[PDB]
């Protein structure tokens, strides 16, 4: 992937995270658990749902072939009709097959980027207070209970609240 996250520095997915596309695994004194980031998941669902519907909506016309016949002395127009019908059949097949390959490539990049941005979002909050292991995991230099975990996930993490405790353990 061009953003380097999915099947990249985060090597695999989580079968244990069943309620969304992107999310977190946390681990503290109260234990372990998965949780989807609903906001980035929902936003992605909305974008991709929009892409699918937009494609369907643009492919919502049909070229119509006919059962019309042609005599032995209408070989020219008979073949004109045939080449025309085969003509449009070829452009629409091209349009559909090419669009799908192009869109699939960009859809997968989108997810890759979203996972990447979620990781950055967390790194930016922790800064000093946690150690980045290079695999999407952050080890805290302090105690992070359930509310501390939840603060990281809703983007309200309190860096200065934990920096003294972190700095002590870090150094």
């Amino acid at each position: 992937g061009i953003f380097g996250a999915i099947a990249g520095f985060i090597e695999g997915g989580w079968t244990g995270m069943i309620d969304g596309w992107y999310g977190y695994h946390h681990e503290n004194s109260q234990g372990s658990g998965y949780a989807a980031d609903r906001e980035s998941t929902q936003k992605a669902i909305d974008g991709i749902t929009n892409k699918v519907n937009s494609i369907i909506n643009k492919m919502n016309t049909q070229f119509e072939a006919v059962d019309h016949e042609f005599s032995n002395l209408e070989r020219r127009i008979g073949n004109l009709n045939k080449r025309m019908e085969d003509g449009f059949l070829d452009v629409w097949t091209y349009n559909a097959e090419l669009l799908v390959l192009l869109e699939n490539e960009r859809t997968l990049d989108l997810h890759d980027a979203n996972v990447k941005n979620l990781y950055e979002k967390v790194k930016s909050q922790l800064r000093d207070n946690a150690n980045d292991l290079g695999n999407g995991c952050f080890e805290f230099w302090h105690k992070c209970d359930n509310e501390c975990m939840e603060s990281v996930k809703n983007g309200t993490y309190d860096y200065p609240k934990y920096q003294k405790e972190s700095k002590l353990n870090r150094q």
């Binding site: 992937g1 997915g13 079968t15 494609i55 492919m59 559909a96 699939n104």
Partner: protein, 325 residues
Amino acid sequence: DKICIGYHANNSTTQVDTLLEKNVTVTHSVELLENQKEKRFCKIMNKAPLDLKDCTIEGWILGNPKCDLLLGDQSWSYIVERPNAQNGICYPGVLNELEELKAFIGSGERVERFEMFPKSTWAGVDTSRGVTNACPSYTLDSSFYRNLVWLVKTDSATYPVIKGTYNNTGTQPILYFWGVHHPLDTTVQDNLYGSGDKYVRMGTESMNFAKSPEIAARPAVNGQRSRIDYYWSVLRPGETLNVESNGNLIAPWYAYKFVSTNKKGAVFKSDLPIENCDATCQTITGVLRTNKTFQNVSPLWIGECPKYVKSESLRLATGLRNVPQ
């Protein structure tokens, strides 16, 4: 204590292709193409199609004596013609502008048969002896088209000038037919229509037609070396038709009030069964029941169908790359 960022994985084995990569397994995807059909004909807009069975379009609309099952009024959502139908033009000859006639009929929805010229129209001629073993019914060896009448001169007299007129005072256009007989020799000619130069002339406000018999022996077809040139036209609402002949006329007898479909109109050449079912999309090779955008079943259809395409699959990724561990 720690928190990790990550992504969904699942049990999916479904794959998509991309420009950079083939056979990529993804967590969620959606197929846009339908490749499945019900191999049968159904109703469209709860309206049944017209099965020709063992009659061709020509045999049905001319009134071939073996197409009596179809004879009369018909309504249809589309027409199914059978590939090896035998009952078409029984007395050898060409139906003029045949392909244009089929396209016209295909654009229709309902025909009402009616007597346009009663045989009483034609004065001083015989209207009861116009049969042939080229056109048998299921009960007699010698009959003729139900919508045409083969006129022969009487007892021993001459074939006089006969005339006919119909004024379309209705709201519907009228599809009608007529012919000109071409005997194999000058004796048959004389024996049927008498001596003299014969003609068939017809005219409306927008159409006029004139033909004379062309006497020659053609190869035998259905026992006949003679021919008939069949013709057809459409008498518009408000138009009147004048007929004038002194021999060799196969006269219009019954005709059709024609209701043109606002929609598309289809003529399917198929041996597929017509069953008791409803459909929204009917292709020539079967019914489609889908909410899908594409289909690779057929370019020929009636109703609201998905776009025809040659692809085997158009699978769009929605979820992400599936990497379970």
